[PDB]
Symmetry: D2
Subunit: 481 residues, 4 copies
């Protein structure tokens, strides 16, 4: 038996071992062909038609490259063909649990539709994996290639979700600790999933990627850090790591949190809410699930994809009128309208428990201005976006180990002051976007007065356009002028 070759525009010709092919050629993996990587970003960036499927191949490919690289350079690590496959499998499978429109589903749909449940795509990836394995006769095929399903299935799932329950992992011991850093690096977020999506999202969005993962791979080594074996970067490359998270943040600003992309994701989510009662997805034993409950049964979830959008769009059932009308207004580009953007100030930190209350606050504002129409809470959306370097307030580069040229086996720490003064002083912040559902000229004018008035009242930053959109309101606030 020989390898399958697959051509990918990002990575070129990738070789896939027959076990990986077996996993890929299943309904549970192929499902990822019908889930757009960037959700509603396709409706803003017309090149972003790419799906989770090809992203997963790439992650699997890169996990293999990193593990081979480490193995060829340091044979004393005892990296086995078995470890390589298990890392490739984890990389292939870490995106299995995504739902329709990727981050729209667990980021917006599930939290509103079922506020009580605790669901992430990572948890889904682990459940969908198990389902893939059992439904498809994968265990014997693993054994055929030297894998041991008892330990290795555990290893794979641990790589995706972390500790399943003082070394906390059963899949592998502390001397393979570095394997846990490849696919999903819980310590600092420097992993191959980022490296595929940087290169791949840039290719499709029409933005260029400034981070060189192949250079990182050539400089990476394993060293003993606090009695674990860990992946270490070369000292003088610390600048590139900082830039890696800078790039992540700027891809979030330019594309992933695009103000129209997010409002499209919001309109899609609203339509899913209105359709949730009347759509049925046949699960295991012929049982019936909703869009919001297909997450409890992997056989139903298997069939939950972006197709839901077009089920609703093309439906004739009058119970779906409301859902269908909202999708129709997306097609006509009759979208909820962007009013503006602001941030908090000092150490105001807007908590999740207060998200529901923000539209009422905006409608409660009392601008000293004569207004033709008057707007209510229902007429406002307030979207709160938590921008960070992947570790809330923490600097992930403080959780990175390095080595120097003169003694490559010796791990060292590097602080922000040892690198540059031109680096960020904070590593997290919030943006607040405000939109109005009432879109004629007179409503939009009013929305802008209320909005800027509210920014004034809450001591938020002056919107960039504030003097233009609300010249009677911005003189009131001393901090602004």
């Amino acid at each position: 038996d020989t390898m399958k070759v697959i051509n990918d525009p990002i990575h070129g010709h990738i070789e896939l071992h027959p076990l990986l092919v077996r996993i890929i050629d299943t309904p549970q993996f192929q499902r990822l062909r019908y889930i757009k990587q960037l959700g509603g970003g396709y409706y803003v960036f017309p090149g972003a038609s790419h799906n989770r499927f090809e992203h997963s191949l790439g992650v699997g490919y890169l996990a293999g490259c990193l593990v081979h690289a480490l193995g060829e350079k340091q044979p004393e690590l005892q990296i086995s063909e078995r470890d390589v496959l298990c890392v490739q499998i984890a990389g292939l499978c870490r995106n299995l649990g995504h739902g329709p429109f990727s981050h729209m589903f667990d980021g917006r749909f599930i939290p509103l539709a079922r506020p009580e449940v605790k669901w992430t795509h990572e948890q889904g990836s682990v459940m969908m994996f198990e389902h893939l394995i059992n439904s498809n006769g994968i265990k014997p095929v693993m054994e055929q290639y030297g894998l041991i399903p008892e330990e290795d299935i555990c290893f794979i799932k641990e790589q995706i979700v972390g500790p399943l329950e003082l070394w906390p992992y059963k899949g592998r011991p502390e001397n393979k600790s570095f394997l846990y850093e490849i696919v999903s690096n819980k310590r600092n977020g420097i992993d191959v999933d980022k490296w595929d999506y940087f290169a791949r999202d840039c290719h499709h969005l029409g933005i260029q990627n400034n981070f060189d993962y192949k250079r990182f791979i050539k400089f990476a080594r394993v060293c003993e850090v606090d009695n674990e074996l860990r992946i270490c970067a070369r000292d003088k490359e610390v600048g590139n790591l900082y830039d890696m998270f800078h790039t992540r943040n700027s891809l979030h600003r330019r594309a992933y949190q695009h103000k129209v992309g997010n409002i499209i994701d919001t309109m899609i989510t609203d339509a899913f809410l209105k359709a949730d009662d009347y759509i049925e997805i046949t699960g295991a034993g012929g049982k019936k699930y909703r869009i919001s409950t297909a997450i409890d049964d992997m056989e139903a979830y298997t069939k939950l994809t972006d197709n839901i959008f077009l089920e609703i769009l093309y439906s004739t059932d009058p119970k779906l009128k409301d859902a269908r009308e909202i999708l129709k207004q997306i097609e006509y580009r009759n979208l909820f309208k962007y009013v503006g953007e602001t941030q908090p100030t000092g150490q105001i930190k807007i908590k999740r428990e207060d998200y529901e209350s923000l539209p009422k606050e905006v409608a409660s504002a009392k601008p000293k201005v004569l207004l033709d129409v008057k707007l209510k809470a229902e007429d406002f959306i307030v979207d709160v976006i938590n921008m960070d370097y992947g570790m809330q307030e923490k600097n992930p580069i403080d959780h990175v180990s390095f080595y120097c040229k003169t003694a490559p086996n010796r791990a060292i720490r590097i602080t922000k002051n040892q690198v540059s003064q031109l680096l960020p002083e904070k590593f997290a912040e919030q943006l607040i976007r405000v939109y109005c559902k009432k879109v004629d000229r007179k409503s939009l004018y009013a929305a802008r007065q209320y909005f800027v008035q509210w920014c004034a009242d809450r001591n938020f930053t002056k919107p960039q356009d504030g003097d233009v959109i609300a010249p009677l309101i911005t003189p009131q606030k001393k901090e602004w002028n």
Copy 2:
């Protein structure tokens, strides 16, 4: 009134006129987001997730580039804003008629489901364009921006499908003849649709593009050729024009006619045929249409997209069983198996009316070999692919006009023997691929012996691997050495 900017990975930041934006923001154009450009090719090239929507924006942009370039260099042509917009609209809309999986629908499915009808995506584009214009109050918007609907609608349709019936066109006179060479060039095939898909398909497939469309635009001029003002290429660019069609042929060979890609298209088509009695598509006044009759009402056709594939795959209806199973086999990768490729020799052409007879002819071969199983006509698929330079046996470069540096207004002609001896002798050929529906080790062995024997019997070329797949058959034929 301002231009929308859109960012395209192929062309960068494209500007859209408000009238173009009102056309794009309709159900009839937006449906092109759910039709893959390369149909089944996504299932072989994982980067080829792109859809018809982004290709159409590009054709529209490049149509505008070529018409602006001509207008700037040659003001005497009297090219107006109005002409520019109609060329852009024809370019944006020339792909409106595509069905599910693009060329699969009009090249595999409709010929087999509706043999009696003359259907092309071109004729669909015109029907869909009229439906788009009437359904969305576009005629007053055209008038708002200085177009004259009865004249300009005719012009737009003529650019897409040719004369609607001296000078055969009603929309513009012969002094504007060159404008009909931009979006769909019936004389020699050199047009902006090709240029967009060379660049876009190559970006997504992972095969680099070798044709430079920007260089062609820099050198393009309008000259008088037999009493019409036509587009002329610079003399010493003739070589790049030959390379253009060489590139087109190369992409057909590597990607568009990939042997697995074509058989996935075949399987899907099969699923669609078995499903066609049962799928209802709701059209005008709530009447119901079939997949095969959606082409008869544009309201229904508006809703006929790649969605149909997943409607079938996720159906529970027992009546859709056989269709659903074929699509499920695609997911497991249990595909009909490729047996080999051959071509006709000498004078033999194979006409479209002989296609049905071929699986029978393969089944009737009598290979002199020990064969465990016996295969019937219904076990074989025979795909006949007509490969050419866009004009059957004709050299399209014989239908291009050139100018020289010393007399830029004087059109000339250039023959093949004035360019190079390293150019093709013929400009059309046929490939014949044979596949087997039974996929076991023994049926496949038999399939190979029938196929190679059939090749020998019909005097076709020796398959490349023929001495390996049937070592006992290929000795018999002296022509094969």
Copy 3:
């Protein structure tokens, strides 16, 4: 007369007006073919073989794109073909005054050869432009295309060096003020020269570019600011402008100030100092000049290119032995050895008058360790590098104007707090690199100890590898751990 097309790998097919062709085809322009853009950088990045010539074509191209784009969108500015040509010429001739190995020459060599005189490549470009025009008969050709020599030459020089002495410019009035911001923007540094070197350097270096100059041009508008017409960016592009300076700093970190690149430049400069007396360059009327004095006569400077490197390398005269040995060490790669890098803490900064004393300070450190050799001051090279966003301590985005979508003719200001808390808190810093001229294991061992001890004594930052290269030294300083 028609346009020359040139194919550039960065911009594609650029059209050049016949006047521009005439300026280009002179010894004074063609000179730039023999001057490497990145100096000694090619000896580290083997892709960086590019010369100032192609970069100059690119700057002129982009200068025309920006002026044409402003003209098309805003006809009310009265941009004439005259203005376009002059801006293009200023763009082409901006780099005429570079010397051998570009920034090496005016950044290292001239300051050490002729400490008293003050020479910049900007003034060199103005003096070389004049000599180009005068020696080649360009004035009459200017007039043949409707330029007015006395106004327009003044305008061209002014766009390069700024005012030649309260509206300070003679070449154009205040109502064309925006034209002074295209080629060399003295207010904030946002200009087309950067845009060309970002794309070009990246293409050659093998590092990818994050900045989209074409997006910036699409969003640019001229608006009234303090009673001046200025170029304004769209408000919500403010983040991209910050990203632009971030990309510049990043290229300086990775490439332009590479530690080995800089030392090669330093070694080359040392060879030129040793050669300076003996190399003769013939200027106006057979007067003889040195490498250091060819900047006084433009006929000599025309003949001063990277060729100097090879004339020294290939020489056999005993007078040049010392120069020739240093260049031979470059070939053998027996370079001065990098010791390490630190930065100053607090807001101490090292003034340019202290730079000479710094090698003596390093030799005067007394690390408490067995050293087999003592090093003297002349064994050390100390390279101090100012990193900023182009305006020393200042935020150049404070000197940029913006407009918003609701009133596109109203200029506004945006402050750093209106953008992001993730931005740099400072805009300038110093790097200090230390190298040793004695390269054997013992001397380098000692240099590391002198070095780290000198960092400790001065309260500079702990070198990243300090614990590894000087473990007997770093324990003394409590703050380091």
Copy 4:
């Protein structure tokens, strides 16, 4: 420890320290001062790249191909030692290039030294010898497990072929396939091409059609006529025809560009007029000329693109003629392109005839009234042989393939098994004519002689023939 180098084409390349010692010599570093495409840079301003970085990439790619063969097929017994000798050959096959690359051994040496037979390959072998001996590389080689007696011979043989029956001494015939990596004499499918396709394209602003990585992935070693050879996958045969189509296309667009070539020619004339006056020092202190530097490697080491500027900046009265030609280049006062034509039917122009062609053009008698009469010396006639690397032969007839169902069995694939759309011929000649007199009247005359001459010889009708010579082309019925 490896050194890492960032190349824009290939990315981060790892160099074994033995490679680094070869590279860090005067003999290898001189390749920094020799442009890959010669006078091409004077037409394509992106093509500033030199032979140095091309050499690195051929070295990297030779390494990639041998490694990949070793990993896929351990039964070939490819050792670390074999990998290093193949990387060195790859690295060193360009060492013998002279100023402006193909200008030097294509134009200047054949005119200045017609007596001698000289190629850049021979020069790469002589330069490699000098590199080794001048820099103490033999003991460094021993230190990494190489054996200089055998391994120097193997490296040389990889560049130049056999140095006089299995013809090779550097390796036995079980390692036959290793001779097919750096410079493949059987069919021209080697890594030198792959690097230049990608590199030249990147700098020229033309996009490359060929996927070398895909080729490496599908490559295998099989036995073919009692010899191990690199074989390709059967279905990749179309890609191989494409590779040669790409090569020809790059020749047409860039390497034989009508002005690039005429700049090479002018530079070549400059070097001919300077040859008596430039002196370059060699071993034992002996002086050599531009034309005789090839006889002494210590002198040849100092002979690079710098000679062009030494001539351009010179003050010596004796160099004035050579200096003026180079100054004509700066001012863009070039010899003028007149046109292009080809022979017809079986006609083939012989290399002994090239000299006489300008006499033929000047001796033509166009029926047109002319102000100027032009002599033989006013014309340059450039004959360019365009092929698929093997004169009239199809290189894909010399490639071995394997199919999926029997990967160890070599097969042959004929052109009719592939496509009817492929070339029927694999070689042709282009004839370009230029005039050294550049005034409008001379150029108009040059055009009438040229088209008359094409008509006399029954060559192809130039493409612009009815426009440039409307009074000459109606005489020829074959043309209309």
